[PDB]
Amino acid sequence: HLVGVCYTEDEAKALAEEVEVQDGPNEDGEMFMRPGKLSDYFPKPYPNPEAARAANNGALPPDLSYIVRARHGGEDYVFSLLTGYCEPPTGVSLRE
Amino acid sequence: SDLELHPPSYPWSHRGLLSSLDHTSIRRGFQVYKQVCSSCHSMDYVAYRHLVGVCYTEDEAKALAEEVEVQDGPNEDGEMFMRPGKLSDYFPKPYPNPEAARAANNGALPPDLSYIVRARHGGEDYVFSLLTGYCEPPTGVSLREGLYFNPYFPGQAIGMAPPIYNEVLEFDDGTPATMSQVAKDVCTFLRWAAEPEHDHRKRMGLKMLLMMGLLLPLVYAMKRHKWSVLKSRKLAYRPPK
Amino acid sequence: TNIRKSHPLMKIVNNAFIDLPAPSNISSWWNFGSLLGICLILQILTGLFLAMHYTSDTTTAFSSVTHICRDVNYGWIIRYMHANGASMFFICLYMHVGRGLYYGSYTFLETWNIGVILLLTVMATAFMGYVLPWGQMSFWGATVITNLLSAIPYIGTNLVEWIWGGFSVDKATLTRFFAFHFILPFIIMAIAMVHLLFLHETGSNNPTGISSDVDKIPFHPYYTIKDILGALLLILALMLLVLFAPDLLGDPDNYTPANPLNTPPHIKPEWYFLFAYAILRSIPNKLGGVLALAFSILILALIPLLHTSKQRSMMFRPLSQCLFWALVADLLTLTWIGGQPVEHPYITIGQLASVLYFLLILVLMPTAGTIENKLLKW
Amino acid sequence: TNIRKSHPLMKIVNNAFIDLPAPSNISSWWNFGSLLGICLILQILTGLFLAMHYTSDTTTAFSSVTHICRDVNYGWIIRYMHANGASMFFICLYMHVGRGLYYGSYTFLETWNIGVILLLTVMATAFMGYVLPWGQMSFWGATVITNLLSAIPYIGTNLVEWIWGGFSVDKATLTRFFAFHFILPFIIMAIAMVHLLFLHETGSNNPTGISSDVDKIPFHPYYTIKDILGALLLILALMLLVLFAPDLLGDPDNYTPANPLNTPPHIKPEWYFLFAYAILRSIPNKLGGVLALAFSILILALIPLLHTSKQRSMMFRPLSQCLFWALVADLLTLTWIGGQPVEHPYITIGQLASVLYFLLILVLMPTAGTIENKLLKW
Amino acid sequence: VAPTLTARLYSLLFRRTSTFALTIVVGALFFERAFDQGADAIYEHINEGKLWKHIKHKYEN
Amino acid sequence: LTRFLGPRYRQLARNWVPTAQLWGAVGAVGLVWATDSRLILDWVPYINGKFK
Amino acid sequence: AAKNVVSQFVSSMSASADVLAMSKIEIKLSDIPEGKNMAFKWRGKPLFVRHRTKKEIDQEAAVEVSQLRDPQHDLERVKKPEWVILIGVCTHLGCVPIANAGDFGGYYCPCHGSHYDASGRIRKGPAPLNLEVPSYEFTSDDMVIVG
Amino acid sequence: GRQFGHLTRVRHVITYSLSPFEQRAFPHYFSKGIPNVLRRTRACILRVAPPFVAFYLVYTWGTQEFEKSKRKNPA
Amino acid sequence: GRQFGHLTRVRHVITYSLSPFEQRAFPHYFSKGIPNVLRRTRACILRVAPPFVAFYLVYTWGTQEFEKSKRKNPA
Numbered sequence A: 001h002l003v004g005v006c007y008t009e010d011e012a013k014a015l016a017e018e019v020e021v022q023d024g025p026n027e028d029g030e031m032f033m034r035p036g037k038l039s040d041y042f043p044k045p046y047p048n049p050e051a052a053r054a055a056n057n058g059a060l061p062p063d064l065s066y067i068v069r070a071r072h073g074g075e076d077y078v079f080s081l082l083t084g085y086c087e088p089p090t091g092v093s094l095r096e
Numbered sequence B: 001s002d003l004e005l006h007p008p009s010y011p012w013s014h015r016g017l018l019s020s021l022d023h024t025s026i027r028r029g030f031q032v033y034k035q036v037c038s039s040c041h042s043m044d045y046v047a048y049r050h051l052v053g054v055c056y057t058e059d060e061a062k063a064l065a066e067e068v069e070v071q072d073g074p075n076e077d078g079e080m081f082m083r084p085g086k087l088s089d090y091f092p093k094p095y096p097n098p099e100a101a102r103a104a105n106n107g108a109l110p111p112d113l114s115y116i117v118r119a120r121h122g123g124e125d126y127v128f129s130l131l132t133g134y135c136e137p138p139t140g141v142s143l144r145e146g147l148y149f150n151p152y153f154p155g156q157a158i159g160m161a162p163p164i165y166n167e168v169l170e171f172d173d174g175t176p177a178t179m180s181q182v183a184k185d186v187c188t189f190l191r192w193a194a195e196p197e198h199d200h201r202k203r204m205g206l207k208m209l210l211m212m213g214l215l216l217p218l219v220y221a222m223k224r225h226k227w228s229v230l231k232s233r234k235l236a237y238r239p240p241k
Numbered sequence C, D: 001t002n003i004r005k006s007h008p009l010m011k012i013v014n015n016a017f018i019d020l021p022a023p024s025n026i027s028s029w030w031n032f033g034s035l036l037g038i039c040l041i042l043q044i045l046t047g048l049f050l051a052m053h054y055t056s057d058t059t060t061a062f063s064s065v066t067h068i069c070r071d072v073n074y075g076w077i078i079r080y081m082h083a084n085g086a087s088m089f090f091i092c093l094y095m096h097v098g099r100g101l102y103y104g105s106y107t108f109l110e111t112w113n114i115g116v117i118l119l120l121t122v123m124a125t126a127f128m129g130y131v132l133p134w135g136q137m138s139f140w141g142a143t144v145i146t147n148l149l150s151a152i153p154y155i156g157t158n159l160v161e162w163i164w165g166g167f168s169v170d171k172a173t174l175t176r177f178f179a180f181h182f183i184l185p186f187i188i189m190a191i192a193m194v195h196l197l198f199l200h201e202t203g204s205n206n207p208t209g210i211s212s213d214v215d216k217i218p219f220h221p222y223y224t225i226k227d228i229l230g231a232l233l234l235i236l237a238l239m240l241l242v243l244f245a246p247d248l249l250g251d252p253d254n255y256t257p258a259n260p261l262n263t264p265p266h267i268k269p270e271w272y273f274l275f276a277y278a279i280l281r282s283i284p285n286k287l288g289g290v291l292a293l294a295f296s297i298l299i300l301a302l303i304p305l306l307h308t309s310k311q312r313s314m315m316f317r318p319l320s321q322c323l324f325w326a327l328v329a330d331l332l333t334l335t336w337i338g339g340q341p342v343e344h345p346y347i348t349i350g351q352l353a354s355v356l357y358f359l360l361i362l363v364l365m366p367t368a369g370t371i372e373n374k375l376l377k378w
Numbered sequence E: 001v002a003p004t005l006t007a008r009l010y011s012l013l014f015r016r017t018s019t020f021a022l023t024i025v026v027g028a029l030f031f032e033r034a035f036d037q038g039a040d041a042i043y044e045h046i047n048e049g050k051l052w053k054h055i056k057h058k059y060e061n
Numbered sequence F: 001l002t003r004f005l006g007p008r009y010r011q012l013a014r015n016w017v018p019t020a021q022l023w024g025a026v027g028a029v030g031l032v033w034a035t036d037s038r039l040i041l042d043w044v045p046y047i048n049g050k051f052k
Numbered sequence G: 001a002a003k004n005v006v007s008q009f010v011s012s013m014s015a016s017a018d019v020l021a022m023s024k025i026e027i028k029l030s031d032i033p034e035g036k037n038m039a040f041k042w043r044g045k046p047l048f049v050r051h052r053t054k055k056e057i058d059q060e061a062a063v064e065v066s067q068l069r070d071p072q073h074d075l076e077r078v079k080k081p082e083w084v085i086l087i088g089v090c091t092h093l094g095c096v097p098i099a100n101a102g103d104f105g106g107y108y109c110p111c112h113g114s115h116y117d118a119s120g121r122i123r124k125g126p127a128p129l130n131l132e133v134p135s136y137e138f139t140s141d142d143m144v145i146v147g
Numbered sequence H, I: 001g002r003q004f005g006h007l008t009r010v011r012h013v014i015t016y017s018l019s020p021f022e023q024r025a026f027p028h029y030f031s032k033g034i035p036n037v038l039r040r041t042r043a044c045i046l047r048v049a050p051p052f053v054a055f056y057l058v059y060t061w062g063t064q065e066f067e068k069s070k071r072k073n074p075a
């Protein structure tokens, strides 16, 4: 997807090789790992939906493909949520 | 290698226009699937709940389901655990990978047993004959002991070792587990494992024939009644002088 | 006043089904026109209830069909009703066309020509419908037929890869074939409506091929009750198949999931394509294959221009009667050869029947009609 | 002879689009009839090319839609064309109905009543179409609307569970909604044909509501060229949305996959259902909700029986003109309230607008027409 | 039997299209019970013992 | 509305009343049989056979 | 004949044997402590399992009989006072409520607005009846099947 | 489309017809029927059958020749 | 459906028309046009606008009252 957009063909191949992507059935009947090809998706940190909960906070971090179209305000909101991180006002305890 | 032999017609208790399946033979056949084939042959389309009210009671089918470790979905932590089987679970597959069947058998792939008497020509007759007719190779043709000999097999060289021999477990019914009785019971079960509707379609089929036998002459008589105005009509031509 | 005549909607129903002047003498061979309409409706009603449960992806394409027959409440009844209804539709199409040929009904130029378009459209539908279960025969039938379009000069390979959505019958091909299989029967029904529009212009022909104006009877109740009895007979034949022999007219390979790496021992159509499948393998050339294959159906459009007889019907035509039955038997020969392998006796007699089909329509039957004229001093 | 008149097919085209006597004076408000036909065709052509790639299972229902917009060659163009075409269809339906109400066109009893059936059918289509992407709004819209059928006495729960294929909007519901979404537009087109059949019986009405028989002009070329210009304007509005603001009329929650355990903060329709969504939440009763909801559209069928004026059109009717614009503004009030939460000012003014809608059609407009008669001594 | 069974059936129930429809509807209800069960009973005889309804008493609790 | 109020119409209603009653019976028994409406069908002797 | 085919096509919409067998699902009575809520899919719509502690049970039996919309006691709504089995959808339109952090006893609906207590009786908001409750039967104290 | 009254000119033809309630539906069903079917079989067996009998021979021989072609008595 | 020649009776009415190739498409487009649109706006602003202006007030107040309802100055 990045090819001819932000990177060259050679550049995007080099970025793809940087991860261990789980490939399908081998000659024996087991799943092996190979360097990434261009056709591979961006690698998911949690293979299970509930594995995101226990390895973050209990709360689920949502998928980043479709996010400036999935939250009102678009990119302005995501920019403001990142940029406008501030300290809690009195009366309201944050809970860490 | 090219020449072939076709199975004969064994007089199955269900093959016949209005003949329901022997449910006791299905029951016995499930057992013949349970120990023998299930550790090598997948049945991805039949569940334990499918057996309920057919060959086993609700209590019986629950008890047979609990006998396996089925891999359940996402837990509270984010890992996959094992639990006793519920009725809704499918029949357990011995190989999770398609190529894992190759390396752990012969190199050749054992096909899924759900839909097999409808997936091979001759039906249950063929599967019965392939099991029953396991024999020694004729001279000139070397067998090669990764491929056993069977005449009913299309290429004459089959990777399956014969798992049908006198007594591979017994039944609750006082039935002798002879090679023929072992092979018949799986085939009568595999009929149900390809066509569960069998009994129901024969039933409504009788109702179809009995209704049409009443309706066909009746609609005929309706048409014949209305048409009698034309059929008995008489013509006369009377041109002038 | 009679509201059947005045009311704009009921006016059509009256002029089409009730007060329509119909010949007194039309055979059971005129029943298939209504039976085709029953079959098109039957296919829409069974097809939809299948579409409520069917999945259009290569993953569970086969599994959804299984889910229908196994889990879905009376889903097995609907599934075999649809599969046998498609064959029923084809037995009817053939009787109907044959009747048209025998009785000279083709002289209704537009009606007939719209019927040729109607035949091609039902064929195109059934071909695409068969791919949907994603069985061994579903895939291998698709690959063996689509690959013919490669033989077209220059345009060729580009066309196949455009119909394919890639480089073989794949994920995309299963999905688009469902879309096209869903839309086509409606486009059929609309063409079937225009078919009837053109028929009502002249009214029906009859077994003698002489005009029936002197002896016309109203469609109701004579052809109302005769079409009811006829439909009761079509339901008998359909329900004999669905409820006693559901696997008779079908191929066993379709009961194993698609495998692009493993080709089956035999590659055979359902009976209704066997005659045309035979013609294709009979001619060794790639392009000549498809050009004889298109000409196999497109020939019916020439039949009116090859009418030579002074009489319309074959009723009083014995030379033409023999050459007609020769065509039916020859097509039954091509049917037999279609479902047989390409070895020794079958290659020769296959192409022998193939050359006969075209000789019988293009040369033989137009000659018999001329001789029959000479015999009557006409 | 002119073949436009004699030929059975061309005869219809001539009588419908070419030689049809049309009023000289018909407004741009008469354009929406043709525009609805363009919209129905546009929806069929974009809808099909989507169906060639769309998957009907809960697994990759969302992923197939993504695959279309991301991978499929110009798939994004077709997808937003379909989604905005559905809204375009709805802007047109509303102008068309409003025009019919203002100009007294409803006195064509059958034409109008077939149009009421036509409105319900396009509504039913769009509702089912929205479920297909299987977004948060797709699922939660479906659950919030289907669950209303529970409120029907005795029949209730059984109906919902029959439409559901289970106990909630699940696997089966997504699949059957696709089947019904595929068939409905064709059944719409056939009803739209019967709609036009009934219209041609009287011909078109005009802005004055007086007969135009004394000043009829042929449809070609006057209304041919006027419908071309009108369609060029509809393509402008549609392509403004698709190519500059593709996410404007849509809800962001549909961009996250369906989650039956997590309900969104807001549950709002696309603009075209907002007025009716408001009426529903306005009345606290369960059954009274659905009965006011059905009466929200079914009321149009009563409008002809509530005509009281001696004149057809509102052109010469100022009292009725004000009460008409009150209806449009009141519906715009209901539109606004539909897209707002159920808190303090909105509950009251929401149900205030709701009672006004029904009072304006059932009581207020039939009174103005009577007074207007008295003022003319009529 | 003095006027025919058909003659008394026309006089009472076939004259009016109302009672003709009513006799068909009432006759459809009573036919469905006699047929469904009657054909099921015939299906019992050709599959004696083979069916689960015959086996049932073998596996009780 | 007011045009249909007269002696003839009262006669015309009285004439079609047994007919409109009997069509109601056709509709009811028709609906009862087609849905297998247990509430009503529990009362009829031979149709009673559906022992829970 | 017509009845049968019409019924068979009608039935092809109503059930689906594979969905009907997932009607009764299993949950752990040992996994959850006092007060907490669990997320599990029963029949499709979320199943809520609330454990009622000593500082909550006595509060529900104190609220008067002829106060709510439909006269229904708290004593007859549960088989045993120790455990309360709940359905996580409102009787109005069908919405999943944010549990525990509410006002009138734990539950509150974020759809339109409905105030529910430890059993789930409507205190504030346009809802006709109390929260949904399933059937009850026991064989072991650590595992129960929602029949 | 044409309707009755606009079809054609017919002169001096009397048609006598009976009510379906005065006449039987199957007058001489087997007595007149059986002779009739045999008569129209006889009238057509020479036009219908000889292509099918020809196919049957081409089918029976073809199937026979297919089987006895792969097998061989010498090496 | 009716066609020309069967619509209605009209007597003593002369219609003078010009070929589109002899006349301009936009005769006085802005000079005659602008006065005309203003004229028919004026003819209808009292029937079209007062419901929308009423909605605008019910919209502007409603939105204002929604915001200033949750907030409170005392405890």
Ligand code: HEM
Binding pocket: B036, B037, B040, B041, B105, B106, B108, B109, B110, B111, B120, B127, B130, B131, B158, B159, B160, B161, B163, B164, B186
């Ligand atoms: C149960 C005794 C049993 C049956 C029945 C059975 C049948 C069977 C068939 C019909 C095939 C091949 C399909 C075909 O006809 O072309 C086949 C394939 C293999 N089998 Fe099998 N099978 C039964 C059980 C067992 C058991 C217990 C084993 C292991 C000892 C086994 C092995 C295999 C293998 C290997 C194959 C693939 C080889 C091949 O035929 O090509 N089977 N089975």
Ligand code: HEM
Binding pocket: C029, C030, C031, C032, C033, C034, C036, C037, C040, C093, C096, C097, C100, C103, C105, C106, C108, C111, C112, C113, C114, C115, C116, C117, C118, C119, C122, C188, C192, C195, C196, C199, C203, C204, C205, C206, C300
């Ligand atoms: C989509 C399937 C079709 C339908 C629904 C259909 C419909 C019918 C109907 C209702 C009739 C009138 C009754 C009758 O004479 O049979 C008829 C007649 C006719 N049809 Fe078709 N038909 C179809 C296929 C065909 C085909 C494939 C052809 C030609 C290749 C054909 C050409 C004709 C002709 C010539 C007649 C006139 C017969 C006559 O009255 O003498 N039709 N059709």
Ligand code: HEM
Binding pocket: C040, C043, C044, C047, C048, C049, C050, C051, C054, C065, C079, C082, C083, C086, C089, C122, C125, C126, C127, C129, C130, C131, C132, C133, C181, C182, C184, C185, C188
């Ligand atoms: C012109 C009338 C039609 C014909 C001739 C036709 C033909 C066919 C054929 C031959 C099959 C494969 C048979 C099988 O293997 O079971 C099939 C299956 C299918 N058809 Fe049709 N069909 C028609 C109408 C339709 C319509 C209108 C729909 C959509 C509402 C449809 C949807 C399906 C589906 C989903 C399947 C796959 C399920 C299955 O194989 O049983 N069909 N059809």
Ligand code: HEM
Binding pocket: D029, D030, D031, D032, D033, D034, D036, D037, D040, D093, D096, D097, D100, D103, D105, D106, D108, D111, D112, D113, D114, D115, D116, D117, D118, D119, D122, D188, D192, D195, D196, D199, D203, D204, D205, D206, D300
């Ligand atoms: C499926 C969307 C619809 C289509 C395709 C459609 C088609 C059309 C067409 C082509 C015309 C003639 C041109 C014109 O006067 O606009 C028309 C007029 C008419 N339609 Fe529709 N229409 C639809 C929706 C409706 C609805 C929803 C109603 C009523 C609830 C309606 C009732 C009428 C009436 C009364 C007229 C006569 C207008 C007149 O000439 O004075 N139609 N329709």
Ligand code: HEM
Binding pocket: D040, D043, D044, D047, D048, D049, D050, D051, D054, D065, D079, D082, D083, D086, D089, D122, D125, D126, D127, D129, D130, D131, D132, D133, D181, D182, D184, D185, D188
């Ligand atoms: C009566 C005309 C139609 C209307 C009003 C209509 C309405 C809609 C709507 C509102 C959506 C959801 C919009 C979105 O989220 O993108 C949709 C999507 C869909 N429609 Fe239609 N549609 C119509 C015609 C059809 C037809 C004829 C087909 C089948 C050939 C079809 C197949 C689809 C599919 C597959 C989708 C899902 C893909 C997607 O969301 O983009 N539509 N339609």
Ligand SMILES: CO/C=C(/C(=O)OC)c1ccccc1Oc1cc(Oc2ccccc2C#N)ncn1
Binding pocket: C123, C126, C127, C128, C130, C131, C137, C138, C139, C140, C141, C142, C143, C144, C145, C267, C268, C269, C270, C271, C272, C273, C274, C276, C277, C293, C294, C296, C297
């Ligand atoms: C996807 O394959 C569908 C098939 C099918 O529906 O057979 C009835 C099929 C199955 C196996 C082998 C081939 C198959 O397809 C076909 C398709 C086919 O199409 C035509 C039918 C009649 C006349 C011309 C053609 C062409 N081209 N002629 C013969 N076989």
Ligand SMILES: CO/C=C(/C(=O)OC)c1ccccc1Oc1cc(Oc2ccccc2C#N)ncn1
Binding pocket: D123, D126, D127, D128, D130, D131, D137, D138, D139, D140, D141, D142, D143, D144, D145, D267, D268, D269, D270, D271, D272, D273, D274, D276, D277, D293, D294, D296, D297
């Ligand atoms: C599946 O939900 C589809 C929706 C949709 O297409 O909105 C435009 C939708 C989305 C969110 C919330 C509700 C939704 O559905 C609906 C459906 C609906 O249906 C009608 C429309 C007009 C008149 C009456 C009804 C009804 N009942 N009225 C209001 N909202």
Ligand code: FES
Binding pocket: G090, G092, G093, G094, G095, G109, G111, G112, G113, G114, G125
């Ligand atoms: S459904 Fe919960 S308050 Fe509306």
